[PDB]
């Protein structure tokens, strides 16, 4: 639907080694396609989906150069953050960034973002206008002033409106056989014993792509979400995803309950039940 290109950066201090480790990953929608790890010997941007391997050497060389530079900048940032917060070198800290573009229906930028966290807490963020920053505390206000002085916001807006969208369009065509195929869940309901006046029905959805799905239980069309167990959607290992929803029902009354599945890979919602 609204396709996206997103990158995720993690930098972590390692007191034991007196250095840090920078790891980046890139995704198109829910498919990881690149990684970088500064710990690798001769660290390079590396393919993680088969369709990105049709990029030539200019692409791998230039992406690698960007990450080596960025990885350096984040090592310095870790030191700076340590100072802002009056922290010693004894403990590990984490500096994260994420940015990306959401492609509208018209192939236009729907929403571009860029934000940062420190030790798991929101630190600073580019506002929706792509023109100004919101800083989370006193330390982040120093950063905000630095980045206003150097007009960083114009650099981010340029990227998110220009190369982010342009490259996403290329990836989507390059990998169209997978990134643009909606793979529908394989669904079924299982039955299991339980407790006093208790039998569990589990509605499975296996092998679907993309990750967004709706699984719910109903009795006579009345939603049972209050008493059901819904696990977080989880990766299959093969690029697809898995999820299930389970409910305890009275013994003998299995046929009163129906599991309802919505997924963009199905022409119409599914209704299924214990059989």
């Amino acid at each position: 639907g609204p396709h996206s290109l997103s990158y995720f950066y993690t930098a972590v201090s390692r007191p034991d080694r007196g250095d840090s480790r920078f790891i980046a990953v890139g995704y198109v929608d829910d498919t990881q396609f690149v990684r970088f790890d500064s710990d690798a010997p001769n660290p390079r941007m590396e393919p993680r989906a088969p369709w990105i391997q049709q990029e030539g050497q200019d692409y791998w060389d230039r992406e690698t150069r960007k990450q080596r530079d960025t990885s350096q900048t984040y090592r310095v940032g870790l030191k700076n953050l340590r100072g802002y917060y009056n922290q010693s070198e004894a403990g590990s800290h984490t500096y994260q960034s994420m940015y990306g573009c959401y492609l509208g229906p018209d192939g236009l930028l729907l929403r571009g973002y860029r934000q940062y966290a420190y030790d798991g807490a929101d630190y600073i963020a580019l506002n929706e206008d792509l023109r100004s920053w919101t800083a989370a505390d006193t330390a982040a206000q120093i950063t905000k002033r630095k980045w206003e002085t150097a007009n960083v916001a114009e650099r981010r807006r340029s990227y998110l409106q220009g190369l982010c969208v342009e490259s996403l369009r290329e990836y989507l065509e390059m990998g169209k056989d997978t990134l643009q195929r909606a793979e529908p869940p394989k669904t079924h309901v299982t039955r299991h014993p339980s407790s006093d006046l208790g039998v569990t029905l589990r509605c499975w959805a296996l092998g679907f792509y993309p990750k967004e799905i709706s699984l719910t239980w109903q009795r006579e069309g009345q939603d049972q979400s209050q008493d059901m167990e819904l696990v977080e959607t989880r990766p299959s290992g093969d690029g697809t995803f898995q999820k299930w929803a389970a409910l305890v029902v009275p013994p003998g009354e299995e046929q009163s309950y129906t599991c309802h599945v919505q997924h963009e890979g199905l022409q119409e919602p599914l209704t299924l039940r214990w059989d």
Partner: peptide, 9 residues
């Protein structure tokens, strides 16, 4: 494609 610009925190 990555955003090439880096800015110190």
């Amino acid at each position: 494609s990555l955003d090439e610009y880096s800015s110190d925190v």
